[PDB]
Write a protein that binds this ligand. Structure first.
Ligand code: ICS
Ligand code: ICS
Ligand SMILES: [Ca+2]
Ligand SMILES: [Ca+2]
Ligand SMILES: [Mg+2]
Ligand SMILES: [Mg+2]
Lengths: 522, 477, 522, 477
C-alpha cells in the first residue's frame, strides 16, 4: 500500500508488514535457504584469523578487485585533448561500460566510440571496422583528432592498429593529415593506469617522433606537466593555479577538466578545452617535463627522456606537505621562478591546520587503497599527520613500488605497524579490517560493502569508510575535490579530522550513557 | 509535428552520414503506423551496429551476466576473463535481493579470474578449476557457480564446459558454463538467449524425476522480472493477494531452488518477453506449462494483467482479483488526482533496451502524458510488432539509435521529458530537458504494480516540474 | 585501570565495569536521583504537542538562545581593519569570553583588549580607564587604530565614549590624530549583529563625517562592499574573487580574512591585512555601496545614504542562484563592467550540480536557524533546490524581516509547510523537531544537543544536524567554507545532498534487513 | 638562563609600557626563590588589571556560574542579565556529569533572563519571578534554581534576594541568589568567594538538624574538583578503593543533595584550595570537620596524597592505601617507562588560573620535564606561598600576565611546551611551540589520579613530539 501524501520508495516500503510477511513466505516456501544459525556461523568464520589465512592463499580467484582495465585509462587520457574522440578498436560492450563507469563518477557525458567488431572479425580481423569506424566517427561527431585504443578481443585476434590506420588513410576513409594516434591497450596486462600511460605515449609519439630535427630543449621556456590518470577536477585546477601563481610557463598535457565540467546552460558541448595539438607538437621545446604520477607513467618517461631528451626529475606525486614542497622547489629550479609569497602563505596555512588538528589525528589507524601514486601520497601525508597507515592495498601495485612505500614507512615512527599489499583485492582487505581493525578506511565506493560487513559483526567493530579515490558513485560531486598540493592536503586533513569527530559524536550521543563526552567544543 | 515533418527530420539527420551508414540507419528509423502489424514492413532490428557511431548498446556478457544470471542470489557468478567486465558491471544494476552478502548471497560481489597474459597465451582452464576450489573453500554456502565468459574465452579456445562437468561431478555442485563472450551476437540480446539456454541445459531439469513438491492449482512463476528497485516484490504481492502462489521469480531476488522448482508450476507469467521468451517456450514444449505476457506498469495495465491472469484459473481467483482491484482503486486514484494535473499534456521520448520502451507507455498515459518517440537498443521485430499498436500515429521509432541521432531528434521534437539510460542522462540535462533514468529508475522505484505507480508518478513529477529547469539561462543572456 | 598500549580517555574509560559500579553507587548513595521511570516519563512529555504549547507560551525564560551580545559583533568588525585593536570599554570578563568564542570557531588568535572597569567606576565613570587603557594599548600592542565598543556595565552607568576619548586626546594620553572610532554596543539591545552595524557606522562616521565637502560620488570608480557579521573566510574571499574576475574596482570595508588565517610559519602576527584607514576615508568617492547583509546593516545604510549620498541598492544577500545573479547584475549596472565568461560558466556549473542532485533533495524537510540574512539566504536556496524549509528560526529576527521571509515562502510551492519563528530559541526548536519532524537541521554546533535529544526518543526520530552557521566548535576548519555566490551554493548543495546520502546509507546498512537498498550508485 | 638574565628579561620587557603600568607590572613578575616562605616579599597578586594590556582574566560571573555553581547538575542556573554571558560560557568548561540533559540534569544548557532595555530601565525582578514559574513548569524535575547575576543586576538596583525568598517560600524550593556580577572583584576569584558564601547561606545548612543519613567513620567529600574530563571520577575511584566513602563532589558531577549531605562527613578533601578554601574554613568552624589540601596530579603526588589521607583514619584504611598503591604501581611505571624517555629534559612554561600552575608541576617532573615558568591569572599570595617551593630556583613567576609579556617571555626562554588556555593556544602554535590546553585538557583527560596520568603522559608526548613541529619552516627560507 501507499499513502499518497507520503510515498515510500523501496526503502522503507518493503519494511511494511505485508511485504515482510510475503518475503518470509517466499524464503520458507521456495528458496531452500540455509538456516539463519548456519549463516551466522559462516559469517563469524569469515571474520577470523583462520579464514584470513585461507583468503590470503588464493592463487586463482579474485574477489572485489580494486582496479579496472587498460582502455578505461586510454579513454580518460584521450578526453584530455582538444576536440578529441576516444575510439576503442574492438567490441562495443567495453565502450558502454567505460562510458557508464565515468558517467557515474563525474555525473557528466562521456563521449567514446567503438567500431563494433563482432565474431566475424575473427576470420580476417578488424581492418574494415577501423576504416568505416574512423570515417563514420569523423563525419558524424566532427572531432579534430581520434585517439585509438583496443579492447581485449582485438588484442587476442592480433589486429595491427598501425597498419589498419595507415590502410584507412591509404584508401581515403580519413584524410592523410587527420591525426589518429593509437595505442595497444590489452586489458589482461596491468590496469587502467597502464592504458593511460600507453595512450599518452602513443599521442606524444604521434605528434613529435618524426619532427624532432627542429626541436631545441628549453627554447619555449615552458614546463610540460603530464597528470596521469586523474579523476579529481580539483587536481588539474590546482596544478594550473599553482604554476600560474609562480608565473611558470607550462603545458598541461592531457587536460579533461573542461570537458568533464561543462555548464548546464541549454546546450550539450561534446568537446571543451583540452591540450591542443599545437601544444603536443611544441612539447619537446619545453625546458623539461614533470610526471605527476610517475609510478604509472614509466612508458611516457622512457619516451620523453629517450626522444625529447628531457631530464625528467625524480619527483613524487605532489601530495601532502613534503612532496608539494619538493615539487614547487624543483619547478622553481627548472623554471628560474621563485616560489611567491602567496604559495608560501598557503603552505603555512596548511601547517597551521595540521597544528590545530593534530591531537585528534594522532595515532589514528587507517586501511586504504587506490592507484599506486595516489596510495603512496596518502600514506606519506598520513605519516606527516601522525596517523598510522596500517593496511595499505594497491591491487595494481608492483614490487618496486612496494619497496618505495616500505622505505617511506621505514623512515617514520608512524609506519612501524603498516603493511603494504600488492595483487590483493577488497576481499583480502575485508579480512585485514576484521583481524587487525583500524579506525577508518580511506577508499572508493566499493569500500561501503566492507563497512556494511564490519557493522554486521557489531557496532564496536564497524570501520567507517572515508571516500577518497576512484570511483565514488554513492556521493555527489566529490569528483570536484582536490587531493594534490597544499589545497588538496587541506581538503584531505579536513575530511579526516571531521570523519574522526563525526564518529566520536555518534559514539558519545547516548543519553546518560556516553554523552558525558558529547562535548560542544572539540 | 506532423508525419511529413518527422520523415523530413529523419532525412535531414541522416545527411551527416557517409553513404554506407546512411543507407543502414535509414532502415532503423520509422514513423509509426499502428495499422501495421508486421514491423518488418516498417523497420529493421537486431542487426550489427555501424562502426564509430556511438551506439548505446552493450554486449552478450552484459545480457547474460548483468541481466539474467547475475541476479540469482545464492549462486556465485564468475566473470571469467580479464578484470574490466566484472568491475564495470559490479552492482551497476539494481536487481534487488534479500540475503547475507558474502555469506549466502553474492549478487553485488565481483568474482573474477582476472586473466593475465599467461592465461591468454596458455588458456584459463587450469586457473578456472583452481578458482572453483577456492570459491568452495571461502564461500561454502554457495548453492552453485556460473562461469560467465568474457571476450577472450572463446577466442583462445578454452573448454569451460569440460571444467564445469569435471568440477561439478567432483564437488556434487551445479556449475554452469555460459558462452556469453562479448564478440557474440550484436547486443545484450544474444546474451539473454545464451543465458536461457544455459539454464535449460544445466539447471532447469534437475528435479525432472522428483515428485516431492507439494503443488497447488494456483502455482505460478514470474518470468523476466529482475526486481529493479524491488519491482518483482511489488508485482508478487499482488499475485499472492489474488490467491496465486508465486513459486519462482526469474531472476530478481531469485534462488537456484526456485528456478529448479519452476517446471512444477501451472502458469509462467512473462514480463520481459525479450529476455525470457526462450525458456518460456522451452517449458511449454517440455513440461506443457502455458505462458502469457503481462504488464504491471501503471493501473490500467496492472488491472488488465490481473484480470487476464485470473481468467486462467477458477472463479475463486477471479473473485479475489476483483477484491485486489477494489482494494487498490482508492490508492492509484489518489496518485492520478495528485500527479496527473501536474503532468497532463507533457511529451516524453524514451530509449531503453528490449521491453520498457513499449511497456511503460500505459503508465505515462495513466498520467495524461504522450510518448512522442520510443526505441530500443536491441529489440527484435516481434518487439516492434508489439510497439506499433501501443504508440500513437506519426510518432517516431528508432532502433539502435546513435548518440548523434538521439540528440538531433530531441533538439527538433523538444520533448518535455526524456527517459533513457546513464549514457544519455547528462547530455539532456545540459540541454535543460528533464531526464529520468528508465533502467535504474534513477535509484528510485519500484515502478511495477500499484505501489510502484505511486513512486513513478512522484518521480516523473519531481523531475519534470523541478525548479532547476527554469534556471539554465542566465538572466543577462 | 589503564593498559599502556591502549590508553583510554574519558570515553571509553568510564565504561569500564569498575567506573560504572562506582557511578551507580554515587547515584544510589548520595544523588537522591529521580527514578529512571519518572525521568523517562518526563522526557517523553517534553517531546509532546502539550509540552510544545506550554514551551511556546514562555515570556520570561530563554533556554538555549541562538544569538550573542552586541560587542561580540563590534569586535569582529574592528578586527577587519588594518592594524586595528578592538577595545571594549567596560568589564574584562566580557573580553575573555569574546576572545574564547572566536578562538574556538576560527581556531586562531583573537586580539582584543578591555580597560578593566571595576566596581569603583560606578562612582566616577570609566574616564581614567579610557585614558590609561588607550595609552597602554597604543604603547604595548602598537596598533594604528583602536576601535572602541562597550560592555553592558559601561552602558548602564552611562559612560560618554565620545567625551572620554576626546579627554584622552586633550590630556595627552594619545596623539589627537591617532584614530579612535567608537560605538555604544549595549548587550541588552538587539544581538551580536547589531554590534557589528554599530561598530561599522561608528568607524565610517569617524573617517568621513567631517570631511564630506571634498567628496564626489563616483570619483574613485570603485564599489564599496560591506560584508556585515561574517564568520566564513570563504565569504570574504569569494566576493573579492568574483569582483576581480569581473574587473570591478572595489573596497571591502571590514576584511578580517587575513588576520583570521595567518600562517603557522614560526612567528605570531597580531595584525594582518584588513581595510586601510585610507579605504574608509575615500569610501564616499565610490560609485555606490553594497551591503551584503542588509537586515543587520540598517544603521550603516542610513549613514551611507544620509551622508555619503550613495543610492544603496535593494539587494538580498548573494546566496543561491537568483540572488547571486541579482548581485552580479547590480554590480554590472553600477560598474559598467559586463559579467565575464568565467562567472557565466561557474553559474552553469552550479546549475549542472542542481540538475544532477535534484532527485535526492526533492521534498527534503529542514529545520534551520542562524542570523537573519544567512537564514533567509539559506531559505531561498533550499526553495531553489526543491527542498521544504519547514521550521525557520531566527532568534534575533524582527517583524519586518519575518514578513520578507514569509513573502519569499509564499512565492514558492516549496514554502507551503514553512513557518518562520522570531524571538524563539533552540528549546522552542527542540519541540518543533519532535512534533513536526524534519529530515535534517541546518544550524550551528548547539544543534548537536537537539540531535542527541531526538536520538534518545529513538533512531527513527533522530534529526541529524548539518553544521552551517556560527558557531561551529565541534568540527575543524569549517570556517574555511563558503556560503555566498555560486561557489557557496555549490558547497551548500554538496553538503546537503551528501548529508542525505550519508543518512540513507546508515539506514540501509543493515545486513539482510535494509541493505536491499544499500546501492553502490546513487 | 640565570637569575641575572631573567631579572633583565623582566626589565627589557617592561620597557615598552608607560610609567604607571611599568611600575605596577614590575610587582607582578618575579624570579623564584624556594627559600622564601612569604611570597608578599617578592610578588603582588590579586590586584586590579592594568587597562588595555590584554589580561587573560575573566570575571566574577565566570567564577561563580562557570566554575562553582554551573557544574551542579540537578539544579538550573539562570544567567540573569543580557544574553552574552550565558552564551559565551555555555558548555565551554568540561565539568562532566551523568544525567539526562533537559530532564533531570541541566549543566550544558543556557538558561537566561535575556535582558532587554525595558528590563534594564524598569528592573528585572518581575521578569525573574515569571521566569522561575516558567522553569518549574517546563523543567519539573529540577531540584533547585540558582540566580547568577551578570553585570547589570547590581548596577540597576534589582533585589534578587527578595525574589529568591518569596518564590522559594511559594514553591517550597531552594532558590539561590548569587551576586557574582562581573564588575565585582578583579577576576574569577571573587566569584568563587561569593559562590561559596551563597552555598553557605542558602544551601549547606538545610539538613543541619536532619540525622536520617547514616554516616560511617570513613565519610569524606571531594571539595574543589570540577571533574574536568572526568578528573573527579578518576580521583573518586581511588578514595573508594582505599575504603573511604565519598559522600559528595564539589561540584563536578555534583548533586544538590550531596552538597546538603556534606556537613555529615568526617573529612573534607580540598583539591582546589583557591576556589573552595572559603567553604572548607566555614565547615571546620561550624561543624568541626577538618579539611586538608591534596594533589592527584601524577603518581608521586597521588601516592603522597593517598598516604596523607589514609593517615587520618585507622590502620584498615592505611592498609588498603598500600593495596591501592601496589595495584596501580605496574600501570604508572609502564607509563613512565614508555613516555619519560620521549619527554625527559623538556622545558615547560605554564599559565593557568588559581591551582594547576603549581599543582601539575609534579606530574611533569614524573616525566622528567622541567617547569621553567609558571603563573596564575587570579591567584592570591597564599597560592604563591605554595608555589615557590614547587618551582625551581631562578624560574620565572608571573601574576596576571599580559599577552605582550607572555609572548616576549616565551620568545626569550624558548620552552619546549606551553600549557595555558584557549586565548593563548593559537599564538604559540604559530611560533612553533607545542601547546597543551591546561584548562580544558584539549578535549582529553582526565588527568587526575593514576588513570589520568596515563592520558596526561600520552597527551604531552603526542603534542611535544608531533611531526607537525618540524615543518613550520619552508625549505626555501
Ligand atoms: S531484461 Fe533487458 S536495457 Fe528485459 S537487457 Fe536491460 S531490467 Fe532494460 S528495457 Mo537495462 S529487455 Fe530488463 C532490460 Fe529491458 S538491464 Fe533492464 S532496464 S526489462
Ligand atoms: S576552580 Fe579555577 S582557570 Fe580551581 S577558576 Fe578556572 S577547573 Fe583553572 S587552574 Mo580554568 S582555580 Fe579549576 C580552574 Fe583552577 S575553570 Fe578551571 S582550569 S582548579
Ligand atoms: Ca553533471
Ligand atoms: Ca588555526
Ligand atoms: Mg574513540
Ligand atoms: Mg573500553
Amino acid at each position: 500500500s501507499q499513502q499518497v501524501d507520503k510515498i515510500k520508495a523501496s526503502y522503507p516500503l518493503f519494511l511494511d508488514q505485508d511485504y515482510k510477511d510475503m518475503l518470509a513466505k517466499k524464503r520458507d516456501g521456495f528458496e531452500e535457504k540455509y538456516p539463519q544459525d548456519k549463516i551466522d556461523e559462516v559469517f563469524q568464520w569469515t571474520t577470523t584469523k583462520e579464514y584470513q589465512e585461507l583468503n590470503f592463499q588464493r592463487e586463482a580467484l579474485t574477489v572485489n578487485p580494486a582496479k579496472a582495465c587498460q582502455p578505461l585509462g586510454a579513454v580518460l587520457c584521450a578526453l584530455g585533448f582538444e576536440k578529441t574522440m576516444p575510439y576503442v578498436h574492438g567490441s562495443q560492450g567495453c565502450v558502454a561500460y567505460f562510458r557508464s563507469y565515468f558517467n557515474r563518477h563525474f555525473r557528466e557525458p562521456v563521449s567514446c566510440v567503438s567500431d563494433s567488431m563482432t565474431e566475424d572479425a575473427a576470420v580476417f580481423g578488424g581492418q574494415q571496422n577501423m576504416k568505416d569506424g574512423l570515417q563514420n566517427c569523423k563525419a558524424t561527431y566532427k572531432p579534430d583528432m581520434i585517439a585509438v585504443s583496443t579492447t581485449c578481443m582485438a588484442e587476442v585476434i592480433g589486429d595491427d592498429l598501425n597498419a589498419f590506420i595507415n590502410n584507412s588513410k591509404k584508401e581515403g576513409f580519413i584524410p592523410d593529415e587527420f591525426p589518429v594516434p593509437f595505442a595497444h591497450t590489452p586489458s589482461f596486462v596491468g590496469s587502467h593506469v597502464t592504458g593511460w600511460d600507453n595512450m599518452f605515449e602513443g599521442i606524444a609519439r604521434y605528434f613529435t617522433l618524426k619532427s624532432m630535427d627542429d626541436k631545441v630543449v628549453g627554447s619555449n621556456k615552458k614546463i610540460n606537466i603530464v597528470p596521469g590518470f586523474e579523476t579529481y577536477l580539483g587536481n588539474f585546477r590546482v596544478i594550473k593555479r599553482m604554476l600560474s601563481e609562480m608565473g611558470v610557463g607550462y603545458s598541461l598535457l592531457s587536460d579533461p577538466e573542461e570537458v568533464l565540467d561543462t555548464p548546464a546552460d541549454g546546450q550539450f558541448r561534446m568537446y571543451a578545452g583540452g591540450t591542443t595539438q599545437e601544444e603536443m607538437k611544441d612539447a619537446p621545446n619545453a625546458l623539461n617535463t614533470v610526471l605527476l604520477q610517475p609510478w604509472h607513467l614509466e612508458k611516457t618517461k622512457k619516451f620523453v627522456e629517450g626522444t625529447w631528451k628531457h631530464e625528467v626529475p625524480k619527483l613524487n606525486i605532489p601530495m601532502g606537505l613534503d612532496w608539494t614542497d619538493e615539487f614547487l622547489m624543483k619547478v622553481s629550479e627548472i623554471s628560474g621562478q621563485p616560489i611567491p609569497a602567496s604559495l608560501t602563505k598557503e603552505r603555512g596555512r596548511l601547517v597551521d591546520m595540521m597544528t590545530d588538528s593534530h591531537t585528534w589525528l594522532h595515532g589514528k589507524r587507517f586501511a586504504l587503497w587506490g592507484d599506486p601514486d595516489f596510495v603512496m601520497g596518502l600514506v606519506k601525508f598520513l605519516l606527516e599527520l601522525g596517523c598510522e597507515p596500517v593496511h595499505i592495498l594497491c591491487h595494481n601495485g608492483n614490487k618496486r613500488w612496494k619497496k618505495a612505500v616500505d622505505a617511506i614507512l621505514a623512515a617514520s615512527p608512524y609506519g612501524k605497524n603498516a603493511t603494504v599489499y600488492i595483487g590483493k583485492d577488497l576481499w583480502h582487505l575485508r579480512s585485514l579490517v576484521f583481524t587487525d581493525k583500524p579506525d577508518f578506511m580511506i577508499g572508493n565506493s566499493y569500500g561501503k560493502f566492507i563497512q556494511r560487513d564490519t557493522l554486521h559483526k557489531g557496532k564496536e567493530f564497524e570501520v567507517p569508510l572515508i571516500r577518497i579515490g576512484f570511483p565514488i558513485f554513492d556521493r555527489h560531486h566529490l569528483h570536484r575535490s582536490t587531493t594534490l598540493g597544499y589545497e588538496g592536503a587541506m581538503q584531505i586533513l579536513t575530511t579526516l579530522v571531521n570523519s574522526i569527530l563525526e564518529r566520536l559524536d555518534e559514539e558519545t550521543r547516548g543519553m546518560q550513557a556516553t554523552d558525558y563526552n558529547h562535548d560542544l567544543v572539540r | 509535428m506532423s508525419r511529413e515533418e518527422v520523415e523530413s527530420l529523419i532525412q535531414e539527420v541522416l545527411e551527416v552520414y557517409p553513404e554506407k551508414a546512411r543507407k543502414d540507419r535509414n532502415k532503423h528509423l520509422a514513423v509509426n503506423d499502428p495499422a501495421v502489424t508486421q514491423s518488418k514492413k516498417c523497420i529493421i532490428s537486431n542487426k550489427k551496429s555501424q562502426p564509430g557511431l556511438m551506439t548505446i548498446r552493450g554486449c552478450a556478457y552484459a545480457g547474460s551476466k548483468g541481466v539474467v544470471w547475475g541476479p540469482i542470489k545464492d549462486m556465485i557468478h564468475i566473470s571469467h576473463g580479464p578484470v574490466g567486465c566484472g568491475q564495470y558491471s559490479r552492482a551497476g544494476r539494481r536487481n534487488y535481493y534479500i540475503g547475507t552478502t558474502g555469506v549466502n548471497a553474492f549478487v553485488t560481489m565481483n568474482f573474477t579470474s582476472d586473466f593475465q597474459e599467461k592465461d591468454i597465451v596458455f588458456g584459463g582452464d587450469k586457473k578456472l578449476a583452481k578458482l572453483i576450489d577456492e570459491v568452495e573453500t571461502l564461500f561454502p554456502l554457495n548453492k552453485g557457480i556460473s562461469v560467465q565468459s568474457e571476450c577472450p574465452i572463446g577466442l583462445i579456445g578454452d573448454d569451460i564446459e569440460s571444467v564445469s562437468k569435471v568440477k561439478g561431478a567432483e564437488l556434487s555442485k551445479t556449475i554452469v558454463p555460459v558462452r556469453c563472450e562479448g564478440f557474440r551476437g550484436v547486443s545484450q540480446s544474444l546474451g539473454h538467449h545464451i543465458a536461457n539456454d544455459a539454464v535449460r541445459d544445466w539447471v532447469l531439469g534437475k528435479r525432472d524425476e522428483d515428485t516431492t513438491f507439494a503443488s497447488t492449482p494456483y502455482d505460478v512463476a514470474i518470468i523476466g522480472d529482475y526486481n529493479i528497485g524491488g519491482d518483482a516484490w511489488s508485482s508478487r504481492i499482488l499475485l499472492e493477494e489474488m490467491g496465486l502462489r508465486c513459486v519462482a521469480q526469474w531472476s530478481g531476488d531469485g534462488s537456484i531452488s526456485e528456478i529448479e522448482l519452476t517446471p512444477k508450476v501451472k502458469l509462467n507469467l512473462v514480463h520481459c518477453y525479450r529476455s525470457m521468451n526462450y525458456i518460456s517456450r522451452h517449458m511449454e514444449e517440455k513440461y506443457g506449462i502455458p505462458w502469457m505476457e503481462y504488464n504491471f506498469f501503471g493501473p490500467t495495465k496492472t488491472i488488465e494483467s490481473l484480470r487476464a491472469i485470473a481468467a486462467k484459473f477458477d472463479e475463486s481467483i477471479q473473485k479475489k482479483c476483483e477484491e485486489v482491484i477494489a482494494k487498490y482503486k482508492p490508492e492509484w486514484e489518489a496518485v492520478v488526482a495528485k500527479y496527473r494535473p501536474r503532468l497532463e499534456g507533457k511529451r516524453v521520448m524514451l530509449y531503453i533496451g528490449g521491453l520498457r520502451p513499449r511497456h511503460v507507455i500505459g503508465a505515462y498515459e495513466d498520467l495524461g502524458m504522450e510518448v512522442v518517440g520510443t526505441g530500443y537498443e536491441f529489440a527484435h521485430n516481434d518487439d516492434y510488432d508489439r510497439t506499433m499498436k501501443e504508440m500513437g500515429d506519426s510518432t517516431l521509432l528508432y532502433d539502435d539509435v546513435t548518440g548523434y541521432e538521439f540528440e538531433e531528434f530531441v533538439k527538433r521534437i523538444k520533448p518535455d521529458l526524456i527517459g533513457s539510460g546513464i549514457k544519455e542522462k547528462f547530455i539532456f540535462q545540459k540541454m535543460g530537458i528533464p531526464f529520468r533514468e528508465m533502467h535504474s529508475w534513477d535509484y528510485s522505484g519500484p515502478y511495477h504494480g500499484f505501489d510502484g505507480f505511486a513512486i513513478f508518478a512522484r518521480d516523473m513529477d519531481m523531475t519534470l516540474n523541478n525548479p532547476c529547469w527554469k534556471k539554465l539561462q542566465a538572466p543577462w543572456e
